[PDB]
Structure formats: C-alpha cells, structure tokens
Amino acid sequence: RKLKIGITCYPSVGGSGIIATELGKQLAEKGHEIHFITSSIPYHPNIHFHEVEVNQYAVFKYPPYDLTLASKIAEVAERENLDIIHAHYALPHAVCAYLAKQMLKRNIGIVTTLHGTDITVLGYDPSLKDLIRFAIESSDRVTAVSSALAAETYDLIKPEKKIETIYNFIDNTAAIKEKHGILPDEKVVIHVSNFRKVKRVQDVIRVFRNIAGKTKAKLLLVGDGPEKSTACELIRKYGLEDQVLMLGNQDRVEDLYSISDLKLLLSEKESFGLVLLEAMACGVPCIGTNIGGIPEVIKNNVSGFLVDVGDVTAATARAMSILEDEQLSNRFTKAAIEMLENEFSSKKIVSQYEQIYADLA
Amino acid sequence: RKLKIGITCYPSVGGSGIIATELGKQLAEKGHEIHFITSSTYHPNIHFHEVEVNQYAVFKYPPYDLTLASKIAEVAERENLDIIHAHYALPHAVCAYLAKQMLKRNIGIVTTLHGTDITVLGYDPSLKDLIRFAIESSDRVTAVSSALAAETYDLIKPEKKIETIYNFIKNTAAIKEKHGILPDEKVVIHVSNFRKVKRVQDVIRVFRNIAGKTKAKLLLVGDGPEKSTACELIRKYGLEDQVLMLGNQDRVEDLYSISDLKLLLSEKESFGLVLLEAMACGVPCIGTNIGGIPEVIKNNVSGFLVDVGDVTAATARAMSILEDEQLSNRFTKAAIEMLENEFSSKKIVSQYEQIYADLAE
Numbered sequence: 001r002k003l004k005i006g007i008t009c010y011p012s013v014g015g016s017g018i019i020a021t022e023l024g025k026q027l028a029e030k031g032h033e034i035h036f037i038t039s040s041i042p043y044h045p046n047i048h049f050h051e052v053e054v055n056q057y058a059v060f061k062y063p064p065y066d067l068t069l070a071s072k073i074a075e076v077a078e079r080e081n082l083d084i085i086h087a088h089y090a091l092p093h094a095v096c097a098y099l100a101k102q103m104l105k106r107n108i109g110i111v112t113t114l115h116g117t118d119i120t121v122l123g124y125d126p127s128l129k130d131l132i133r134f135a136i137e138s139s140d141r142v143t144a145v146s147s148a149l150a151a152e153t154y155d156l157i158k159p160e161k162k163i164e165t166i167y168n169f170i171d172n173t174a175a176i177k178e179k180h181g182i183l184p185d186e187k188v189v190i191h192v193s194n195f196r197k198v199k200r201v202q203d204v205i206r207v208f209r210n211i212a213g214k215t216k217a218k219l220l221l222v223g224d225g226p227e228k229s230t231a232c233e234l235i236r237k238y239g240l241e242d243q244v245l246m247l248g249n250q251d252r253v254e255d256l257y258s259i260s261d262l263k264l265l266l267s268e269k270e271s272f273g274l275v276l277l278e279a280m281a282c283g284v285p286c287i288g289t290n291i292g293g294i295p296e297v298i299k300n301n302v303s304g305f306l307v308d309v310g311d312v313t314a315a316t317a318r319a320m321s322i323l324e325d326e327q328l329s330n331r332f333t334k335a336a337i338e339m340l341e342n343e344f345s346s347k348k349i350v351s352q353y354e355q356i357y358a359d360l361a
Numbered sequence: 362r363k364l365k366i367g368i369t370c371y372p373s374v375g376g377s378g379i380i381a382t383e384l385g386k387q388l389a390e391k392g393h394e395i396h397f398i399t400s401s402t403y404h405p406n407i408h409f410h411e412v413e414v415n416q417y418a419v420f421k422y423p424p425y426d427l428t429l430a431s432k433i434a435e436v437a438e439r440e441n442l443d444i445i446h447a448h449y450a451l452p453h454a455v456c457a458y459l460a461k462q463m464l465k466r467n468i469g470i471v472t473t474l475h476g477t478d479i480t481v482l483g484y485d486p487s488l489k490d491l492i493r494f495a496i497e498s499s500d501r502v503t504a505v506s507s508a509l510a511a512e513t514y515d516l517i518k519p520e521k522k523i524e525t526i527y528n529f530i531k532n533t534a535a536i537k538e539k540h541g542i543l544p545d546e547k548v549v550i551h552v553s554n555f556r557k558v559k560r561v562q563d564v565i566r567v568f569r570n571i572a573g574k575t576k577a578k579l580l581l582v583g584d585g586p587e588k589s590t591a592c593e594l595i596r597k598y599g600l601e602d603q604v605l606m607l608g609n610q611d612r613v614e615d616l617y618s619i620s621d622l623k624l625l626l627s628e629k630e631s632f633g634l635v636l637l638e639a640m641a642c643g644v645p646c647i648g649t650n651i652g653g654i655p656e657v658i659k660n661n662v663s664g665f666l667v668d669v670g671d672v673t674a675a676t677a678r679a680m681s682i683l684e685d686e687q688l689s690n691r692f693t694k695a696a697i698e699m700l701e702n703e704f705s706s707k708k709i710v711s712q713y714e715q716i717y718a719d720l721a722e
C-alpha cells in the first residue's frame with residue numbers, strides 16, 4: 001500500500017543526512033511518495049522537495065527556524081495529505097513534527113529516529129532533558145540507530161517510550177592509487193570522520209606512526225573539521241607529511257575505501273559509525289573502539305578488532321596482525337560482508353522502517 | 362491572593378518591552394511574585410531568568426524557541442508559577458504552549474498582542490495558521506487596542522476571545538540651552554523606531570512647512586532603518602540646522618518637556634505608546650486616523666487626527682496649536698484627564714490581575 005511520507009531532517013550533516021536522504025530514495029523506488037521538508041537544497045519523480053525559508057521579519061531577535069519548520073510541515077501535511085512525518089533527531093525535528101500535528105486538524109503518524117545528537121546536545125546543556133523526553137514521548141514510534149544509543153537514551157532522558165533499534169545501512173584501484181601517487185607496495189590505512197574531538201584523530205595518528213615505522217604505508221585522512229590543525233601539527237611533530245594524504249572532504253569516498261587495506265575508527269563517542277559499513281562494503285578490515293554502537297558493528301576477532309578508548313599500543317598490535325596476515329584480513333572482510341548482506345542490508349532496514357509506517361497508517 | 366507569574370517577552374524592543382516590564386514592576390508592588398523569562402535596582406519580588414541559546418555544532422540555527430520553551434517549563438515547575446504571560450503570539454505564545462504541554466501541572470497562559478503578529482504576517486502570509494494556533498492555544502488573549510483586536514480577527518480569524526486592555530503610563534531653560542534651542546523657537550517632537558510605517562518623511566515635510574512660518578526646531582528621537590532616509594530629506598529641504606537627530610534616548614521626558622507639539626503620522630499603529638508619554642508631559646499631539654491612534658486622541662478635544670499622508674491638514678492643525686495658546690492648553694488638560702481615567706496604571710493593572718485571578722484556583 002503506497003503511502004505519502006514527509007521526512008524532516010538536516011539533509012547533510014555527515015551520517016544522518018545521508019541516511020535520511022537514502023532512506024527516502026529507497027522508499028521512492030518502492031513506489032511511496034516522499035516529501036522532504038528541509039532547508040533549501042542545491043532525482044526520482046516520486047520524491048519532492050519543500051523548502052523552509054527562514055526570515056527575521058524584523059520582529060524576531062533570532063530567526064524562528066523551529067516555528068517556521070513546524071508551519072511548513074503542517075502546510076505540506078495538509079496539501080499533500082501526508083500519512084507520516086518522519087523526523088530525524090529529537091531536537092528540533094521531532095518537536096516541530098509535534099507542533100505541526102497539533103496545528104493539523106487531521107491526525108498524522110510521527111516517527112522519530114534518534115541518531116545520537118540529542119545525547120551530544122544534552123552534554124552541552126543538561127537542562128534540555130525534559131524537552132527531549134517530551135519530544136520522544138510525543139512521537140508515535142521512536143527508533144534508534146543502535147541498541148547502545150537506545151540504552152544511553154533511557155539512561156539520560158528516561159522517557160516513557162519504547163525505543164526500537166533499527167540500524168543504519170549503505171547504498172579500478174590501480175588508477176586510483178596512481179591518481180593519488182600511491183605505489184603498489186604501500187599499505188593503505190584510511191580514516192574518515194568529521195574531525196571532532198570525540199573522534200580522537202590524535203590516536204589515529206599515533207597508531208599510524210607506529211605502523212609506518214614498521215612497514216611501508218600511507219594514511220588517508222578524509223574529512224574536515226575542528227581538529228584538523230591539531231592533526232597537521234601532530235603529522236609534522238612525528239614527521240609523517242610524505243606518508244599522509246589530507247584529503248579534506250571528499251566525494252568518491254568509495255574510491256578511497258577501495259584502495260585501502262585498513263580502516264581505523266577510534267572514537268570516544270559513536271552511536272553507530274556509518275563509515276565502518278562503507279569500509280566493510282569495500283572489503284576493508286576495521287579496528288574500532290569498543291564504545292557506543294561500534295561493537296554492534298564490529299564483532300571482535302570475527303569481523304575486525306575492538307580496542308579500549310585511548311589504547312594506541314593495542315590498536316597498533318591489532319593493526320599489524322591485520323596488515324601482515326592476509327588470511328586474517330580475508331576472514332574479517334568476508335565475515336563483515338555477511339553482516340552487510342543480512343543485518344545491515346538496505347533491503348532489510350528499509351523494510352523495517354516501512355513496517356513502522358504501515359503500522360501507523 | 363498573591364500569584365506567581367512568569368512573563369515572557371523581548372524585554373525592551375520598544376513599546377511592548379516597556380509595557381511588559383512596567384506591568385511586572387506594577388504587579389511586583391502589589392506583591393505578586395514576578396519571574397521574567399527572556400534572552401536578557403529592582404523590587405525584591407521581581408526575578409530574572411535568562412535563556413542561553415547555542416547551536417553546539419548540532420543545530421543549524423540556534424533554537425531559541427525550543428530553549429525558551431524549555432526554560433519556561435523549568436521555571437514553571439520549580440517556582441509553581443500560576444500564570445505564564447506571553448507578549449507576542451510569535452514566538453512567545455507558542456513557547457508558552459509548548460512549556461505547558463511539557464508540564465505535569467496545569468498553568469494559565471495569557472497572551473498579549475501588540476501588533477507584531479500582523480507585521481510578521483504581511484512579510485510571510487504562510488504563517489497565518491501558526492499565528493492562529495498560537496492565539497487559540499492561549500487560555501486568555503488580550504490586545505492593546507480594539508482596532509488591533511478587530512484587525513486580528515479580520516486577518517487571522519481565531520476562534521478565541523481577544524479582550525482589549527490598553528497600554529498605560531522641569532528646568533526647561535537648562536534643557537533647551539543644552540540642545541542649543543533658543544527661547545523664541547517652537548519645538549516639534551517625533552519619537553519612533555524609524556520604520557517605514559512611521560512615515561518620517563511626512564513628519565519632516567510637515568515640519569518643513571511649520572519652520573517656514575515660524576521659528577522652529579524639530580527633535581527626531583530614536584533610531585531605525587529610515588533614519589538615513591530622514592537625514593537625506595532634511596538635507597534636501599535645507600533644514601540641517603533646524604533639526605536635532607538625537608538618536609535613541611533616555612530621559613525622553615526632558616525632551617517632551619521642552620516640546621510644543623508631537624507628531625505621530627504613522628500608517629500602522631496599534632496603540633502609540635509615545636502619545637501617552639507626550640500627553641503626560643503636557644505636549645499636544647497630532648496623529649493619523651488609524652489603528653489605535655483614535656482610541657487615544659479625541660479629535661479637537663485632546664489633539665487632532667488627520668488622514669494618513671495628509672501633510673496639508675497636518676500642517677494646518679500644527680499651526681493652529683502652535684499659534685493658539687488657549688487651544689493648546691485645552692488639549693493638554695483634556696489629554697491629562699484621559700490619562701488619569703482610561704489609561705491609568707491602577708485601572709489597567711487590575712484588568713490584567715482579574716485575568717490572572719480567573720485562571721488560577
């Protein structure tokens with residue numbers, strides 16, 4: 001049964017944005033009518049974009065994006081007769097969905113997906129606890145991208161609400177290596193992140209120093225963010241400028257995972273770690289920290305390795321085990337691919353979102 | 362029975378900011394407990410609570426509406442507020458509504474319209490339903506004039522009673538000396554925010570005719586976007602030496618005290634708080650025949666009213682006042698008795714108190 005589904009999110013912060021957009025693309029492919037309600041964007045015929053323009057109107061001291069977004073949700077809900085609004089993030093989107101629902105004369109189902117950013121915000125301003133709780137409680141169905149995010153939510157927010165785990169999902173290496181001046185005999189390590197402190201790039205670099213000081217190696221650092229200059233400085237301090245490619249942000253990140261032999265994600269906080277799936281899909285074995293959602297993706301000594309937060313020497317050892325032992329590497333990669341094709345497959349995950357919409361319609 | 366009353370507003374935009382803070386000052390004196398909740402000597406029963414809006418790398422816009430709602434809820438619960446009194450439908454009534462859906466308690470929401478919601482709506486017609494929802498989700502709604510009540514009903518159509526409750530309110534040789542005004546100059550004053558709706562260009566033209574018929578100074582008091590337009594027009598008519606651009610001011614009372622005539626020739630004006638100030642200081646007023654201005658000025662009794670844009674009639678009215686001391690003192694006397702009756706703080710504060718009393722129990 002074809003539904004009309006509104007989706008309200010920030011179209012791209014890194015991981016979440018990609019997930020919401022991708023999810024909309026896959027529902028479109030299944031014949032559903034999808035209506036993104038977002039800030040202006042720069043596609044399938046069943047996907048439509050509605051833009052929220054915020055103005056100050058010379059009355060408002062701060063631009064009222066929340067209220068403007070609520071308004072626009074309600075307007076679209078009504079004109080297009082939406083069955084669902086799917087909000088990504090409790091704040092602001094789930095509260096806006098709620099406001100839009102109270103404006104509408106019609107009932108409409110609200111689904112909210114927590115990606116982790118409500119926990120982050122709560123760390124900056126714990127007084128938002130009640131508002132986040134309300135937003136969760138006022139949704140019809142609430143999902144989280146990991147069981148560990150869900151548990152953390154229950155712990156800090158304590159809502160009277162079942163939070164269901166629905167995981168994230170994902171959609172010529174000689175030439176690419178050549179483009180990037182990587183030689184046939186260099187081992188390629190990759191790290192993709194938004195360079196925030198919680199990512200601990202400094203740990204990624206200390207591990208890579210250890211690596212490149214044993215075998216011959218190149219590090220691909222992909223992304224941009226606040227701790228970039230901390231990264232460079234540390235690259236220069238250790239003398240690794242020839243051996244590291246600061247690629248900034250990238251498109252064609254699949255090209256970069258395709259040429260890599262090892263993926264490091266050594267975060268102190270991580271609700272899921274979408275970058276792990278992408279590397280797994282490209283047959284790149286992973287080491288991650290044993291926090292947050294990471295151990296729901298990497299199964300230790302089965303699909304990759306897990307290490308303690310900050311444990312550089314343990315991650316080095318794991319890293320070499322993998323870089324030398326082609327047999328270990330291949331068994332990891334193959335175990336990872338099996339996860340992709342079952343638990344993390346877009347077909348299974350899009351159907352779990354879809355079952356929620358049908359429940360509510 | 363003393364009550365605990367939260368007040369959410371922008372604490373000194375201009376008129377509304379003055380009203381909301383004086384109202385709280387006056388309720389404090391009668392022994393109510395007043396909690397201002399805003400983005401920021403005083404009576405001991407007045408308390409201030411500040412909201413801090415931050416993005417935290419998560420939000421694209423700082424969510425002031427959501428943070429404000431969250432702070433109202435928090436103060437409401439901690440202090441057992443009986444009442445939240447919001448000034449402006451947007452954002453404050455909606456923030457108060459949100460705070461009230463968050464509270465385990467019931468709380469009375471009082472919303473006062475000042476006319477900004479009409480301004481917002483002219484700029485963005487799609488916010489109609491939101492403004493309507495904000496009005497209908499308040500428990501009681503007031504408006505600063507019957508003209509605003511009526512225009513609100515005609516433009517927004519809320520199913521909600523809007524009650525009219527009005528706004529409420531020496532060594533001149535030294536002052537005139539200080540501003541270089543000589544003893545034989547007539548002084549005309551205009552106090553506004555220099556928005557386009559104030560028609561400062563009509564005030565200046567009228568002044569221009571006056572100044573060609575008698576020795577005159579014009580005090581233009583305040584700041585805003587059309588200030589530079591005003592300046593230019595002054596230059597064009599050659600009046601630089603006859604006009605004082607005082608910019609924003611405190612002790613506006615000093616300036617009224619040296620003035621013989623006040624012009625308010627707006628094309629939109631819900632109430633016109635500046636008329637009451639000028640009346641209290643013994644200055645006769647000419648206003649346009651719109652919005653609330655006629656609820657304040659009685660034509661030929663306590664000032665004159667003219668049509669919007671009618672420079673000829675304003676000039677002729679201005680000359681009749683500046684030439685006839687008898688007329689002027691009759692206007693000024695009559696104006697002052699209106700102030701003691703219709704626009705007294707004792708009367709208006711008690712009207713607000715009665716609303717609060719109806720809502721608490």
Ligand SMILES: CC(=O)N[C@H]1[C@@H](O[C@@H](CC(=O)O)C(=O)O)O[C@H](CO)[C@@H](O)[C@@H]1O
Pocket residue numbers: 013014015016017019115116117120145168194198269270271272273274275
């Ligand atoms: C810090 C954190 O929890 N980040 C999660 C979070 O990342 C955020 C961005 C961020 O907060 O760094 C996002 O992409 O919206 O959600 C991702 C997608 O669901 C997860 O894969 C990330 O692990």
Ligand SMILES: CC(=O)N[C@H]1[C@@H](O[C@@H](CC(=O)O)C(=O)O)O[C@H](CO)[C@@H](O)[C@@H]1O
Pocket residue numbers: 374375376377378380475476477480505528554556558629630631632633634635
């Ligand atoms: C243009 C307009 O309607 N202004 C009203 C409005 O003024 C606004 C400022 C403005 O938008 O001009 C305010 O001060 O909040 O509210 C005042 C207080 O009730 C009224 O005296 C003004 O007449």
Ligand SMILES: O=c1ccn([C@@H]2O[C@H](COP(=O)(O)O)[C@@H](O)[C@H]2O)c(=O)[nH]1
Pocket residue numbers: 014015016018192193194222223224248249250251253272273274275276278
């Ligand atoms: O330069 C970059 C940095 C990050 N990403 C993408 O941002 C997302 C980060 O998700 P997560 O690891 O925060 O969950 C991934 O899809 C990743 O490929 C890029 O496309 N280019």
